[PDB]
Amino acid sequence: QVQLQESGGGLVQPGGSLRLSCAASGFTLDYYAIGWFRQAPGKEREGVSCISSSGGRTNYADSVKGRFTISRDNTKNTVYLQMNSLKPEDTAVYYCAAWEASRWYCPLQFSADFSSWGQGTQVTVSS
Amino acid sequence: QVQLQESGGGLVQPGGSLRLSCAASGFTLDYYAIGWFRQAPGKEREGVSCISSSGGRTNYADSVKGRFTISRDNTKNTVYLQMNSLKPEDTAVYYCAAWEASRWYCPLQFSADFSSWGQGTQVTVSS
Amino acid sequence: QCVNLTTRTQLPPAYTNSFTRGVYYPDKVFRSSVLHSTQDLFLPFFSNVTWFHAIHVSGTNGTKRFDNPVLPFNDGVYFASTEKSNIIRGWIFGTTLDSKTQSLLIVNNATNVVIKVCEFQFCNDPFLGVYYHKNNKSWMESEFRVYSSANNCTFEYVSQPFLMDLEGNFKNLREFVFKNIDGYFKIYSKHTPINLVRDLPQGFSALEPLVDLPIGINITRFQTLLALHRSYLTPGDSSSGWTAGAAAYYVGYLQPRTFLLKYNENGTITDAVDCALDPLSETKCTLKSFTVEKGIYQTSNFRVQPTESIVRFPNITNLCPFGEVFNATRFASVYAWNRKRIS
Amino acid sequence: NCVADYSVLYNSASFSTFKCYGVSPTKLNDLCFTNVYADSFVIRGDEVRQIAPGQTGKIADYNYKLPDDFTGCVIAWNSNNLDSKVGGNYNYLYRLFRKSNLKPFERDISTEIYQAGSTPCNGVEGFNCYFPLQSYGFQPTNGVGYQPYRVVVLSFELLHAPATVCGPKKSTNLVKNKCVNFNFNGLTGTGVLTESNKKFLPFQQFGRDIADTTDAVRDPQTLEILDITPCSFGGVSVITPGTNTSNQVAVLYQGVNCTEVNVFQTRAGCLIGAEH
Amino acid sequence: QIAPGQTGKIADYNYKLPDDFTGCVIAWNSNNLDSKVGGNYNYLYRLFRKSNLKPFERDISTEIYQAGSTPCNGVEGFNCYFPLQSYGFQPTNGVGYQP
Ligand SMILES: *[C@@H]1O[C@H](CO)[C@@H](O)[C@H](O)[C@H]1NC(C)=O
Ligand SMILES: *[C@@H]1O[C@H](CO)[C@@H](O)[C@H](O)[C@H]1NC(C)=O
Ligand SMILES: *[C@@H]1O[C@H](CO)[C@@H](O)[C@H](O)[C@H]1NC(C)=O
Ligand SMILES: *[C@@H]1O[C@H](CO)[C@@H](O)[C@H](O)[C@H]1NC(C)=O
Ligand SMILES: *[C@@H]1O[C@H](CO)[C@@H](O)[C@H](O)[C@H]1NC(C)=O
Ligand SMILES: *[C@@H]1O[C@H](CO)[C@@H](O)[C@H](O)[C@H]1NC(C)=O
Numbered sequence: 001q002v003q004l005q006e007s008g009g010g011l012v013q014p015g016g017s018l019r020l021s022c023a024a025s026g027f028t029l030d031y032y033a034i035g036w037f038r039q040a041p042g043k044e045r046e047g048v049s050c051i052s053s054s055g056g057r058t059n060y061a062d063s064v065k066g067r068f069t070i071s072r073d074n075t076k077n078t079v080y081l082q083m084n085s086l087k088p089e090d091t092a093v094y095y096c097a098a099w100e101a102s103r104w105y106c107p108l109q110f111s112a113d114f115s116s117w118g119q120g121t122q123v124t125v126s127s
Numbered sequence: 128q129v130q131l132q133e134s135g136g137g138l139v140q141p142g143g144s145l146r147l148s149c150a151a152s153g154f155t156l157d158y159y160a161i162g163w164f165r166q167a168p169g170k171e172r173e174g175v176s177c178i179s180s181s182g183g184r185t186n187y188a189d190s191v192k193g194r195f196t197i198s199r200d201n202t203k204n205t206v207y208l209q210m211n212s213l214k215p216e217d218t219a220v221y222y223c224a225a226w227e228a229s230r231w232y233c234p235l236q237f238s239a240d241f242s243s244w245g246q247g248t249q250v251t252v253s254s
Numbered sequence: 255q256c257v258n259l260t261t262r263t264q265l266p267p268a269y270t271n272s273f274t275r276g277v278y279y280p281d282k283v284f285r286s287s288v289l290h291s292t293q294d295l296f297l298p299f300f301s302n303v304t305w306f307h308a309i310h311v312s313g314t315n316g317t318k319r320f321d322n323p324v325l326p327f328n329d330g331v332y333f334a335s336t337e338k339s340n341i342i343r344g345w346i347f348g349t350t351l352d353s354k355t356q357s358l359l360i361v362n363n364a365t366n367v368v369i370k371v372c373e374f375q376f377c378n379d380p381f382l383g384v385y386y387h388k389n390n391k392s393w394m395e396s397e398f399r400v401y402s403s404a405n406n407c408t409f410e411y412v413s414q415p416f417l418m419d420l421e422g423n424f425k426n427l428r429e430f431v432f433k434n435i436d437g438y439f440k441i442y443s444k445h446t447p448i449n450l451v452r453d454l455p456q457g458f459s460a461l462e463p464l465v466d467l468p469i470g471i472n473i474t475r476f477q478t479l480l481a482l483h484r485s486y487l488t489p490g491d492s493s494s495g496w497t498a499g500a501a502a503y504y505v506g507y508l509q510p511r512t513f514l515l516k517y518n519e520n521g522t523i524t525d526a527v528d529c530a531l532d533p534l535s536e537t538k539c540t541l542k543s544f545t546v547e548k549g550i551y552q553t554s555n556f557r558v559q560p561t562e563s564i565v566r567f568p569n570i571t572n573l574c575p576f577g578e579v580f581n582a583t584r585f586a587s588v589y590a591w592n593r594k595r596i597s
Numbered sequence: 598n599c600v601a602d603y604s605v606l607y608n609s610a611s612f613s614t615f616k617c618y619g620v621s622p623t624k625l626n627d628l629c630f631t632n633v634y635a636d637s638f639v640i641r642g643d644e645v646r647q648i649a650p651g652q653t654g655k656i657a658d659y660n661y662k663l664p665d666d667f668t669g670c671v672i673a674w675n676s677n678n679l680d681s682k683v684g685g686n687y688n689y690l691y692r693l694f695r696k697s698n699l700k701p702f703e704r705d706i707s708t709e710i711y712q713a714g715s716t717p718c719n720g721v722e723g724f725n726c727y728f729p730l731q732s733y734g735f736q737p738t739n740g741v742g743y744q745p746y747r748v749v750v751l752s753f754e755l756l757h758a759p760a761t762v763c764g765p766k767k768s769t770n771l772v773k774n775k776c777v778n779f780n781f782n783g784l785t786g787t788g789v790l791t792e793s794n795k796k797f798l799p800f801q802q803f804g805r806d807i808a809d810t811t812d813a814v815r816d817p818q819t820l821e822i823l824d825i826t827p828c829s830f831g832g833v834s835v836i837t838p839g840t841n842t843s844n845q846v847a848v849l850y851q852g853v854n855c856t857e858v859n860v861f862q863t864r865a866g867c868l869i870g871a872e873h
Numbered sequence: 874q875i876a877p878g879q880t881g882k883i884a885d886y887n888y889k890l891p892d893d894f895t896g897c898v899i900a901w902n903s904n905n906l907d908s909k910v911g912g913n914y915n916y917l918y919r920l921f922r923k924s925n926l927k928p929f930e931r932d933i934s935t936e937i938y939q940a941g942s943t944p945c946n947g948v949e950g951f952n953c954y955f956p957l958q959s960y961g962f963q964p965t966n967g968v969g970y971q972p
Pocket of ligand 1: 301
């Protein structure tokens with residue numbers, strides 16, 4: 001009954017802003033580390049941003065520094081991703097994945113297995 | 128994209144033999160019973176030979192019994208009709224039709240709709 | 255290579271009674287001076303076990319032919335053999351017993367054992383060619399005529415002989431239980447000398463586990479390997495074989511049973527009770543004791559079992575007006591659709 | 598008969614699926630098993646969800662029913678650059694049609710042509726008859742859902758039997774006639790060990806008396822067996838002449854002789870603090 | 874054309890069948906009951922509509938459709954056609970045209 005559900009996708013103007021949500025049902029999302037992942041048309045699934053279980057550690061892809069902000073609410077069992085200064089290069093389907101650290105060290109910069117995945121949401125940037 | 132295509136028509140000598148084949152594309156001919164039908168000049172279209180879907184039951188017109196043999200190649204999605212001792216009475220445009228049984232009872236003796244139709248091939252017996 | 259023998263001619267079956275035999279250790283735990291109940295594939299007490307002579311003399315002329323039919327292997331087989339001169343050499347297990355399916359072979363020569371799991375192309379009459387040496391006669395040299403070709407081998411095992419050297423009424427029993435559970439082919443064995451008993455003797459003997467094989471194949475039928483001491487090219491009139499097959503082997507079939515097993519203070523199995531043999535044994539099961547005192551005891555619960563399930567419905571000629579609709583005289587136009595509800 | 602280092606697998610961060618059922622994945626190195634079975638295959642991506650107990654689907658039903666009481670781990674990773682070819686790699690075959698669902702861990706390699714209709718096929722494909730196995734277009738340009746994924750399932754078996762595979766841990770010395778926390782062949786407990794005169798058959802490892810607790814146990818390093826007795830327990834009963842009369846007290850330990858604990862030994866136990 | 878998720882003049886312009894049907898389609902030949910020697914034109918069919926139909930939607934409107942840019946105002950003429958055309962149900966017709 002474990003479910004991950006994305007929300008907030010849509011069509012926006014380049015330079016505008018959009019905000020995504022990932023909600024978890026059937027389990028407590030606070031203990032898991034969550035990462036936002038996108039696949040562009042004709043491209044492979046790249047890691048956009050990740051946040052630790054407690055939220056004290058974060059990592060972002062160099063394409064999105066200064067533009068995207070990730071955070072989570074462990075009381076509301078949600079993880080949020082805010083997008084600002086949005087560009088046509090970001091047109092993709094966005095997944096949220098929850099997993100646990102498979103390596104030593106606090107940071108989440110490395111990639112690993114991702115235990116649970118959502119169905120993805122579409123954000124299109126075109127003007 | 129469902130298509131029925133007849134082949135093998137031509138001009139033959141009375142007393143000779145000819146073989147027709149009906150092939151199916153865009154759908155597997157495999158679930159349907161197939162009957163072969165002809166329309167002589169100035170006559171309505173009559174049922175000459177029919178064979179059940181999976182091939183355990185057959186039916187022949189009395190004009191053609193002991194002369195035509197219906198067989199249907201299973202693996203190749205094709206139904207054949209072997210004509211032997213052809214007569215000038217057999218000169219007609221020959222159609223292959225596919226449908227599901229309108230009835231219980233294994234026999235295909237009776238007639239009803241034919242869901243898919245080919246464009247037909249010409250069989251002419253004259254000498 | 256294999257050698258063709260004569261037709262088996264389908265000898266009629268013969269049965270004998272098994273007096274409390276085939277009990278093996280179910281677990282690998284030492285237990286002392288208790289009674290343990292286990293539900294495992296056992297051999298019921300006082301059961302019919304089919305027996306075959308190793309060599310049978312049945313023809314009027316005096317023909318000697320091996321009685322080695324292929325027997326079914328369903329949920330375990332109990333193989334007991336009374337013998338004195340080492341003519342049985344092994345067994346073969348498989349479904350089709352040819353190159354189409356994997357097969358398992360156990361043989362026993364004078365030195366060790368050969369357990370092989372490959373795709374053996376088996377002939378109709380597997381056997382081991384047998385001849386002594388001209389000067390020593392102490393050991394026995396076997397020529398294998400068991401299979402034609404071996405391919406796709408996935409297992410190999412060698413260890414001390416399963417059958418002891420038997421080299422004149424000192425017959426011996428070698429009792430084995432073969433089980434194929436969770437891809438695992440388990441053997442329980444025990445050797446016991448006998449004196450002046452043709453059939454299975456009356457008594458108890460626990461069968462200790464011998465070896466456990468991760469074969470992981472499918473087994474349905476099995477055959478017995480036999481040693482040909484005589485010559486197939488030139489069969490003698492008599493005495494070329496061993497005393498007209500005085501030795502014989504007994505085959506028993508296992509079914510799931512619950513057994514009450516009595517470990518002694520040394521940890522050895524000293525007595526058994528099969529639960530469904532007689533009401534007294536059922537009482538011994540329910541009381542968890544070998545000794546039952548005088549009185550009345552409620553053991554089980556009798557219950558009649560139902561038979562054909564039945565599902566019935568009413569009978570009315572009045573029904574849905576399908577016929578009035580399907581056999582209707584008139585049907586509406588196709589762009590002003592007549593919709594009728596049936597309720 | 599080989600040590601399993603699950604840290605190399607778990608901490609690799611290359612496998613796209615780490616699903617462990619009945620056993621936590623971080624304690625695979627701390628428990629150990631009599632045997633473990635490995636099944637290694639390449640399956641599509643929308644379908645690795647079907648490799649777990651209690652699920653349905655063409656591979657879940659018609660290929661491999663995993664029983665609801667699984668004790669094992671499901672491991673899978675991507676094979677786009679190792680399995681797929683430019684022209685399509687069709688060397689792996691899969692059935693869509695079966696007469697009934699496969700049994701738990703049941704293998705069927707039968708190439709019989711299935712009858713979708715009424716009359717038999719007789720070993721020929723066709724009209725209500727299909728060859729059972731279809732091929733897959735594993736290509737390097739395919740989408741993620743259709744990309745090949747290499748799956749290995751590890752079913753750990755846990756019965757009351759000798760353990761032949763054990764994780765990375767250090768065996769320590771053996772001390773006798775003292776209250777210890779012991780771990781023999783994965784059997785954990787607390788008690789005092791004593792030399793025992795019992796004899797164990799070559800297949801026999803553990804011993805029991807009346808209950809689930811193991812009375813005796815065998816040694817792996819040396820072919821020896823030692824029995825287990827629980828560490829001493831008893832009720833501490835306190836004697837008093839009444840605090841009104843005096844503040845002196847005496848203590849009684851039920852059912853022990855006065856070795857482990859003005860000493861008076863009684864059949865009720867050792868009495869401490871009361872004169873005789 | 875009578876099945877879920879299909880297209881065609883009857884499928885679109887007559888009765889759209891939704892993709893999530895739970896039901897049965899049943900039909901049989903009525904050559905000897907519906908056809909007459911002179912042709913049975915009592916069954917009318919539309920070939921033109923403004924838009925495709927909703928599932929189980931029934932329209933009995935007889936408004937003349939505007940094929941061109943000028944309005945018809947309920948009167949036929951150039952680029953103005955009545956909705957329903959009649960069918961030539963005859964006992965000598967082919968099965969594709971048989972009722
Ligand atoms: C065993 O076989 C004998 C025939 O020799 C038969 O009378 C008896 O009923 C059989 N017993 C069982 C339990 O089948
Ligand atoms: C073994 O083979 C038989 C056919 O001889 C078959 O019915 C059975 O299912 C097979 N068992 C296994 C476990 O493969
Ligand atoms: C078996 O038990 C008897 C007593 O019943 C004892 O005298 C004998 O020593 C025991 N044998 C072994 C091998 O323990
Ligand atoms: C229906 O059942 C009634 C029960 O009395 C019986 O009399 C009648 O003949 C039945 N009719 C049919 C058509 O089954
Ligand atoms: C102790 O008991 C005596 C009577 O036996 C009473 O007089 C005295 O007050 C008690 N002292 C205390 C401290 O309870
Ligand atoms: C306690 O241990 C001593 C040790 O020598 C023994 O002599 C004594 O009998 C034991 N006490 C009881 C009550 O058994």
